[PDB]
């Protein structure tokens, strides 16, 4: 059909060994869980495609111009997204000690 | 240029009387099957009591 | 043969043309185009008079050129 129970959604994440935060767990549900006051019927059709977009760009056909992503050590690099970048305000002192 | 264009690769590999049936008969919703029209309609604790009997001869079908 | 014309002059009316005619009041048979048609037709007839006479003499003069040359 295109929808699975919300709780069963939690089942895959725990089994898949990929760890997620509770507030993040809320984030996925708010974006994917079927728009209903009660629970149940969380649709993975939208989630599965986007997450898998990094492997091979499914459905490449029908658009010859487009070229899939190559991905590289720079793909996990965005995993570095963090608030530690503040040092970018002034890295000169970091430069001085380093040299 | 009426019937001289005939070619063997065109006559044989072009279906004649078995293409899609003309419109006005395709008006059907493949997703709607019986047991879905009424049982799955929704149901309601209170029904809309309103009834009406239009003052025109009901169409015979 | 087939009959695709009601008469020699008017094509069958456009389907929107017959609004009435349910009762015998509109007929398209009362003409009222008869006078106009005759006037235009008679003038056209004269045109073929002049056109054909010109060809005939042109043939004759060339024919008479045959005799004069023979002289």
């Amino acid at each position: 059909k295109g929808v699975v129970s919300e709780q069963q959604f939690r089942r895959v994440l725990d089994v898949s060994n990929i760890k997620l935060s509770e507030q993040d767990i809320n984030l996925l549900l708010s974006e994917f869980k079927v728009d209903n006051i009660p629970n149940g019927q969380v649709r993975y059709s939208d989630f599965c495609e986007v997450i898998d977009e990094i492997f091979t760009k499914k459905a490449i056909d029908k658009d010859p111009l487009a070229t899939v992503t190559q991905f590289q050590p720079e793909t996990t690099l965005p995993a570095r997204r963090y608030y530690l970048n503040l040092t970018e305000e002034e890295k000169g002192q970091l430069r001085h000690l380093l040299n | 240029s009426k019937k001289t264009i005939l070619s063997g690769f065109m006559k044989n590999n072009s279906i004649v009387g078995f293409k899609e049936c003309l419109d006005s008969q395709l008006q059907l919703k493949d997703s709607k099957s019986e047991y879905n029209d009424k049982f799955q309609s929704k149901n309601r604790i209170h029904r809309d009591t309103s009834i009406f009997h239009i003052r025109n001869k009901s169409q015979i079908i | 043969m087939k009959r695709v014309k009601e008469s020699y002059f008017r094509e069958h009316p456009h389907w929107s043309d017959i609004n009435g005619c349910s009762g015998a009041k509109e007929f398209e048979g009362e003409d009222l185009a008869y006078d106009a048609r005759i006037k235009y037709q008679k003038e056209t007839q004269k045109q073929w008079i002049e056109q054909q006479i010109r060809e005939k003499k042109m043939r004759e003069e060339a024919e008479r050129n045959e005799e004069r040359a023979y002289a």
Partner: protein
């Protein structure tokens, strides 16, 4: 409820129908393409009679078109409203009969009955409660009248209880248009009396008679003559589709216009019909309609009604009108002309009213009356037939296709008997 099917054959039969379905069509508001756009709710209450339903809601007349030559039915389609007829119903051959009755009744017409009759038996069976059949055909063409009559005989043997209507056009002797007419009319007319329940006679000479002198149209054409017949033919079944003061279907008219089984020949007409140049002097009131419906020149049959005596008459008025002025005016015409009316059947006129007048008109009437004047038509046809037969002229055509000369004598006698017997009453007294 009590609908009627249509079976029009032969060219002259084909053209007449070519406009008839256009006439009634504009009455109920059926568009040329088959979608409904009518205004009044009543314009759809009783549409079942002439029209049938199909998926997608488009409406198809339940008519049968038949002929032996391609020209008739390959042309009617190209005109307005030419697509309403269903493609299957068309039945046409490949040869043609050439006005030879023999070609139309034994060799080509008979061989082609199997297909044509099949469609009729399928179409009629689909009715809820059928009323009958109406046949339009011309008696001047061999191919038309040839298989035209044979169809009537076959139908009667399997539908004994449904009425049978036929509007035949027979050639008047003043304007001659076919040379082999006498053979076709005399033999064909023999079959109609024995089988047909009712037939209203129509003559071209009158159509011109009506056109020049009352509609004052300068140049008549074949289209105009068709128009008047169609309007008149719509009147006979006028009230069958609409409510009225006194509803009167076809069976009702029969019960008041056929004194005896073998006198079933009528003559009809329409009124009013005012000239484009006269509609501002005439006054539309009930008295005007009654007088014109009896005037001799209006009748579609060349035989003047005043040469004999009336036996039965019916008038189906249209629109709203005081039933007083129908009865009183109708009674008016039966006391000041006692010489023209048979005596042993008192008040020999029928009355009816329909509540929906023809579009664009307020009062109108159609007549159906069996008059002894029709005796004139049979005599003129009979006189010519005997003249041409004493020398066996043109007889080699029919004798060479399995038909023997005895049948012609039998046709003459029964037709000969009709003329004499038909007048055993106009001299009869109580």
């Amino acid at each position: 409820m009590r609908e009627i099917v249509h079976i029009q054959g032969g060219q002259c039969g084909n053209q007449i129908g070519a406009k008839f379905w256009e006439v009634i069509s504009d009455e109920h508001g059926i568009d040329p393409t088959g979608t409904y756009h009518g205004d009044s709710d009543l314009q759809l209450e009783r549409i079942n009679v002439y029209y049938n339903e199909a998926t997608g809601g488009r409406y198809v007349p339940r008519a049968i078109l038949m002929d032996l030559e391609p020209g008739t039915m390959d042309s009617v389609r190209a005109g307005p409203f030419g697509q309403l007829f269903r493609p299957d119903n068309f039945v046409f051959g490949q040869t043609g009969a050439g006005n030879n009755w023999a070609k139309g009744h034994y060799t080509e017409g008979a061989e082609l009955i199997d297909s044509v009759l099949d469609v009729v038996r399928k179409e009629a069976e689909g009715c809820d409660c059928l009323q009958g059949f109406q046949i339009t055909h011309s008696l001047g063409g061999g191919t038309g009248s040839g298989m035209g009559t044979l169809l009537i005989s076959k139908v009667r043997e399997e539908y004994p209880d449904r009425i049978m209507e036929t509007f035949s056009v027979v050639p008047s002797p003043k304007v001659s248009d076919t040379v082999v007419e006498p053979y076709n009319a005399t033999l064909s007319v023999h079959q109609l009396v024995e089988n047909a329940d009712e037939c209203m006679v129509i003559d071209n000479e009158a159509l011109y008679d009506i056109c020049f002198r009352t509609l004052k149209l300068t140049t008549p054409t074949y289209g105009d003559l068709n128009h008047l017949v169609s309007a008149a033919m719509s009147g006979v079944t006028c009230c069958l589709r609409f409510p009225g003061q006194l509803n009167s279907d076809l069976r009702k008219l029969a019960v008041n216009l056929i004194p005896f089984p073998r006198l079933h020949f009528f003559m009809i007409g329409f009124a009013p019909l005012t000239s484009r140049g006269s509609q501002q002097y005439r006054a539309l009131t009930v008295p005007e309609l009654t007088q014109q419906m009896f005037d001799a020149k209006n009748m579609m049959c060349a035989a003047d009604p005043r040469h004999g005596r009336y036996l039965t008459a019916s008038a189906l008025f249209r629109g709203r009108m005081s039933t007083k002025e129908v009865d009183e005016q109708m009674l008016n015409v039966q006391n000041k002309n006692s010489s023209y009316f048979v005596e042993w059947i008192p008040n020999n006129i029928k009355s009816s009213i329909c509540d929906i007048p023809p579009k664009g008109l307020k009062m109108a009437v159609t007549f159906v009356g069996n008059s002894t004047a029709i005796q004139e038509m049979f005599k003129r046809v009979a006189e010519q037939f005997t003249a041409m037969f004493r020398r066996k002229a043109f007889l080699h055509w029919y004798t060479g296709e399995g038909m023997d000369e005895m049948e012609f004598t039998e046709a003459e006698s029964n037709m000969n008997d009709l003329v004499s017997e038909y007048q055993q009453y106009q001299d009869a007294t109580a």
